[PDB]
Amino acid sequence: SLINARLIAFEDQWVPALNAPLKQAILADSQDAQLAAAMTYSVLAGGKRLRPLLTVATMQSLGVTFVPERHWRPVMALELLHTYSLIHDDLPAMDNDALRRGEPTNHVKFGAGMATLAGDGLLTLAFQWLTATDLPATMQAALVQALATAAGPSGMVAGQAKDIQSEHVNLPLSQLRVLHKEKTGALLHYAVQAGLILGQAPEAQWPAYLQFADAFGLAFQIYDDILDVVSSAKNTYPGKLGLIGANQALIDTIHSGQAALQGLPTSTQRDDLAAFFSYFDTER
Amino acid sequence: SLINARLIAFEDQWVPALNAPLKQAILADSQDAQLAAAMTYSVLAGGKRLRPLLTVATMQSLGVTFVPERHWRPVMALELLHTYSLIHDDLPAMDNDALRRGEPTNHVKFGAGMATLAGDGLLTLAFQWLTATDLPATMQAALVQALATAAGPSGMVAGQAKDIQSEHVNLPLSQLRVLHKEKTGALLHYAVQAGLILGQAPEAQWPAYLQFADAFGLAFQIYDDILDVVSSPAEAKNTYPGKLGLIGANQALIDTIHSGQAALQGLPTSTQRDDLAAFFSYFDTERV
Amino acid sequence: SLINARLIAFEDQWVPALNAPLKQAILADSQDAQLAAAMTYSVLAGGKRLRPLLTVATMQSLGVTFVPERHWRPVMALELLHTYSLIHDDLPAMDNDALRRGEPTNHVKFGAGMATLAGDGLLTLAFQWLTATDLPATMQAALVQALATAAGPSGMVAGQAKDIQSEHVNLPLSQLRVLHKEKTGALLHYAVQAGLILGQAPEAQWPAYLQFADAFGLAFQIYDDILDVVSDEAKNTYPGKLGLIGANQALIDTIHSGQAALQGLPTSTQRDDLAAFFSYFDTER
Amino acid sequence: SLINARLIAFEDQWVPALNAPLKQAILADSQDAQLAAAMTYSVLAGGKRLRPLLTVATMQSLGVTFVPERHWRPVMALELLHTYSLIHDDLPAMDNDALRRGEPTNHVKFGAGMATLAGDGLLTLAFQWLTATDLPATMQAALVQALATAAGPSGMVAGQAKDIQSEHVNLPLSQLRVLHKEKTGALLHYAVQAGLILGQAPEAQWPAYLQFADAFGLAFQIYDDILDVVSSDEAKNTYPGKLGLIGANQALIDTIHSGQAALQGLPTSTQRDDLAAFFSYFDTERVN
């Protein structure tokens, strides 16, 4: 309740702040009207911004103030890349979804060709945004290297590739873990890592922050699997463990993430990031 | 063919050297066998490597030696990205091509889903490669900013978007110029720009090199347009011959080549700059 | 999972056999055609028969085989009563639902007047069915007393009354627990108790079976709450009071208490028979 | 006709004795305060208690003494059930009556939701009360079977269903008889039958007592119809609506005599004279 209140208050302040410059920035950085419209359509489709929120919360836990002119573009680059991944997932060549959050998918509204390009434009634009501001070049290059590693053919795209190939194969849990670590864990790992980079986290604290990020990313996926199964499915936690076992796995993972945060030296740090586990106390 | 002795020697030295590490590098940087197979299929499909060759020629022309462990990944990032653009161009959602250079396109071999992912993987890996070696961080960030600007929604992707929207439209030449400058011009501009970054070109030399690069990118497209009309494989309304006629298209090519050579003549003469100038000999102005 | 397969097999064998005589029996016991049609419509509306299945499982775990001529009407009396509750719940005067199971509710098809009467008819018929066969009268009277107590103004109806009174109120969890024990717990407690009566359970074993029944009924409600929330109303639910994580922790803890209760039974066959019912929560629905 | 002094004496003894424990018993057996308030309001609305009076009169006519701790709950279960039927009858879904005895109905007072539940509560509680005391289980089971058969979808509920179905239909008398026998006849039959069960009446006496019970149930309905017409659409579906007031009164007179004749099959006693006197509730000069 009180830890829940803290997260909801953080989202209430930051989500509108993060969203506000989006339409203007995407348009500024585009030279085709329709492409800008397609990219903006999907970015502004009411996402919770969990990933850049984790980055901001990490920065704040380290005592580093968010300066909009320096940090907004690099922090939101992650959200552009996350959006591109949804646009491509929905494509006729991929999941072939007509709706998402009860609203037409990008290719329904713009055609599959323009949708593919809108995803390509956002992926590319993410890297321009990482390197667009007055940040030390060391920080800029570290963010680029971390994001590309998370998002690329050893991370997110590898996860998506494994998902396509596993559509008709019941995977064992061990392989499903690797798939999830790539497909969804990597960007959540990066979201916290991006805060460590921008906030210049003391080296000794990196493992605790990243253990937390890994547990949170795992929890996120178990939770997503449970919601998907309950709302309506074999390559899912409930598919492998049953619904009770999947909830136990979610609870255990939450606890392991909370234990990781005890490794941090101050209670204010511990409390700052611990509030994110209350994300799983509500629904979507 | 007008390809001269300098260009062929440069190509003979560089193409095998640029190609040799590719398969192993893509495999090392991948965590899925099929994805890695799909990316590698399209990367190793006999591309002439024009863009990274230009970056190397630019570097040499600045007196800076190519060091594989420092420069190979960053120089070849551009080739990964160029490859992704061909993969996505060929998709059923885009140009729907079954063949490229008489061999099956990526989606034909791997399916449209895997092809889409292969392109996404290559585009992302290009940014990993730019930042993968022990170059100064200022230089790494400059490359990333330049490549993202050249390839994204103000550059290559904007060009492709305009291309989709122009399928059944007869564009005025003024508008075709903007489409070309985005679609093919931007990456060829970047190719030389990356050489200026890696070679730490003095600021006073940037205008001549980039005027050269812009003329080169334009000549590339006009020559491609001419080839589209004068040659048969192993509608054309939005091409230079479509707008100007074949003779007019060839005159535009010849003028553009000369403009590029004149730009380079603004820099001191050297054998390395002669090598860079010899890139114009790719364009046979006697086919028309 | 073998435990999951064991429950599914039980359901696959027993649900069609329990369902088969319903249409004819209700018609035989009615003297109005439209009433008979309204009552049968709701009873035949695809329920999983959880409550009579628990009665059958309980009685047979005690060594008493289900005999259709003796046991079918008294066992299915619980289902008629469960159906009445759904019908009245759906009424315009109550929740006002146009749909259930992706199908029109009784009042949409028959009108709110006939739907109210169909509920009244099913509640009354349940008591006729308890006493309609040749079971020993001691058993008949015990079933009646247990069912009336479970369903009445200290049981299910009291739970429904609390539910109406709590529409726009944030109940403390302690009051929600009472509401649940009444509205859904009591009939699930009865489902097992009816099995004890029909199965002539030794007195020493009543506490373990009824502790199981109480745990199962509580788990059932927490699970139903989770499903509802995941698929102002939401505040008076376990996820509303504890968060979704706390509600799932409570479901797991309650399952474990229920399994622990069963460990007090003297044979593995009894233990295993009833433990399979916790597999109900391992799947979605 | 005059009320018999026997009946006055009987009602004066028994009505307050039957009423006295009601409020405390309903409260004891409930676990929600408003529900308990809703049920008790309707039960204590001043009813004549005709049905449980008949049960007690039947019991005394068999030489069996009413003991409150053994008989009160089972006898009054019938009154609970009768009350539920009035509550549900007055509902918006049903007759939509806002008044009964010139004062608030349950739904007007508590809301249609809580009124519906108070009816459900009283119906269920009736079965708890039949089985709540130290009577032989054979006797308890027989009462439950008889009550549920009288009250359910072949009895009272079937009659209520036919009634709401007959709202704007001019029924023939032959069909009106069926509706009556279900809607009001069945509980009045059961009222005497419960006395036969509780009093362990020998089997040879059942026909005379149940013929009396059926005539009594019929006379009750004819008289209620007469009362409806003689003081202040639906008045169409009444005895005087079908037969006129004289014809209805002839039906009443003949039915009273039929019931008295039925009892005359049994040995004469003061207690049977008390039971027979129940017909003097019906004033055969009310039409005049």
Coordinates of N, CA and C in Angstrom, one line a residue, chain A residues 18 21-30 43 70-81 122-135 140 143-144, chain B residues 144-145 148-149 153:
Chain A
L18 N 8.1 12.6 -19.1 CA 8.8 11.8 -20.2 C 8.1 11.9 -21.5
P21 N 7.9 15.9 -24.4 CA 8.6 16.4 -25.6 C 8.6 15.4 -26.8
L22 N 7.9 14.3 -26.7 CA 8.0 13.2 -27.7 C 7.6 13.6 -29.1
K23 N 6.4 14.1 -29.3 CA 5.9 14.4 -30.6 C 6.8 15.4 -31.3
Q24 N 7.2 16.5 -30.6 CA 8.0 17.6 -31.2 C 9.4 17.0 -31.6
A25 N 10.0 16.2 -30.8 CA 11.4 15.6 -31.0 C 11.4 14.7 -32.2
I26 N 10.4 13.8 -32.3 CA 10.3 12.8 -33.4 C 10.1 13.6 -34.7
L27 N 9.2 14.6 -34.7 CA 9.0 15.4 -35.9 C 10.2 16.2 -36.3
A28 N 10.9 16.8 -35.3 CA 12.2 17.5 -35.6 C 13.2 16.7 -36.3
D29 N 13.2 15.4 -35.9 CA 14.3 14.5 -36.3 C 13.9 13.7 -37.5
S30 N 12.8 14.0 -38.1 CA 12.3 13.3 -39.3 C 12.2 14.2 -40.6
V43 N 4.6 5.3 -30.8 CA 5.3 5.8 -29.6 C 4.2 6.3 -28.6
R70 N 20.1 17.4 -21.2 CA 21.1 16.5 -21.3 C 20.6 15.0 -21.3
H71 N 19.6 14.7 -20.5 CA 19.2 13.3 -20.3 C 18.0 12.8 -21.0
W72 N 17.1 13.7 -21.3 CA 15.8 13.3 -21.9 C 16.0 12.4 -23.1
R73 N 16.7 12.9 -24.1 CA 16.9 12.1 -25.3 C 17.6 10.7 -25.1
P74 N 18.7 10.7 -24.3 CA 19.3 9.4 -24.1 C 18.4 8.5 -23.3
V75 N 17.7 9.0 -22.3 CA 16.8 8.1 -21.5 C 15.6 7.6 -22.4
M76 N 15.1 8.5 -23.2 CA 13.9 8.0 -24.1 C 14.3 7.2 -25.3
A77 N 15.6 7.2 -25.7 CA 16.1 6.3 -26.8 C 15.6 4.9 -26.6
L78 N 15.6 4.5 -25.3 CA 15.2 3.1 -24.9 C 13.8 2.9 -25.2
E79 N 12.9 3.9 -25.0 CA 11.5 3.8 -25.3 C 11.3 3.7 -26.8
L80 N 12.1 4.5 -27.6 CA 11.9 4.4 -29.1 C 12.2 2.9 -29.5
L81 N 13.3 2.4 -28.9 CA 13.7 1.0 -29.3 C 12.6 0.0 -28.9
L122 N 12.6 4.1 -35.8 CA 12.8 4.2 -34.4 C 14.0 3.6 -33.8
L123 N 14.4 2.4 -34.4 CA 15.6 1.7 -33.9 C 16.8 2.6 -34.2
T124 N 16.8 3.2 -35.4 CA 17.9 4.0 -35.8 C 18.0 5.3 -35.0
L125 N 16.8 5.9 -34.8 CA 16.7 7.1 -34.1 C 17.1 7.0 -32.6
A126 N 16.8 5.9 -32.0 CA 17.4 5.6 -30.7 C 18.9 5.9 -30.5
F127 N 19.7 5.5 -31.5 CA 21.1 5.7 -31.5 C 21.5 7.2 -31.7
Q128 N 20.7 7.9 -32.5 CA 20.9 9.3 -32.7 C 20.7 10.0 -31.3
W129 N 19.6 9.6 -30.7 CA 19.2 10.2 -29.4 C 20.2 10.0 -28.3
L130 N 20.8 8.8 -28.2 CA 21.9 8.5 -27.2 C 23.1 9.5 -27.4
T131 N 23.4 9.9 -28.6 CA 24.6 10.7 -28.9 C 24.3 12.1 -29.2
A132 N 23.1 12.6 -28.9 CA 22.6 13.9 -29.4 C 22.8 15.0 -28.4
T133 N 23.2 14.7 -27.2 CA 23.2 15.8 -26.2 C 24.6 16.0 -25.6
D134 N 24.7 17.0 -24.7 CA 26.0 17.4 -24.1 C 26.3 16.4 -22.9
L135 N 26.6 15.2 -23.2 CA 27.1 14.2 -22.3 C 28.5 13.9 -22.7
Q140 N 28.4 8.4 -23.6 CA 27.6 8.2 -24.9 C 28.0 6.9 -25.5
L143 N 26.7 3.9 -23.5 CA 25.3 3.7 -23.7 C 25.0 3.0 -25.0
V144 N 25.7 3.4 -26.1 CA 25.5 2.8 -27.4 C 25.9 1.4 -27.4
Chain B
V144 N 28.7 7.2 -34.5 CA 27.3 6.8 -34.2 C 26.3 7.9 -34.5
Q145 N 26.6 9.1 -34.2 CA 25.7 10.2 -34.5 C 25.6 10.4 -36.0
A148 N 23.7 7.1 -37.5 CA 22.3 7.2 -37.2 C 21.6 8.3 -38.0
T149 N 22.2 9.5 -38.1 CA 21.6 10.6 -38.9 C 21.5 10.2 -40.4
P153 N 15.4 8.4 -39.9 CA 14.2 9.0 -40.4 C 14.3 10.4 -41.1

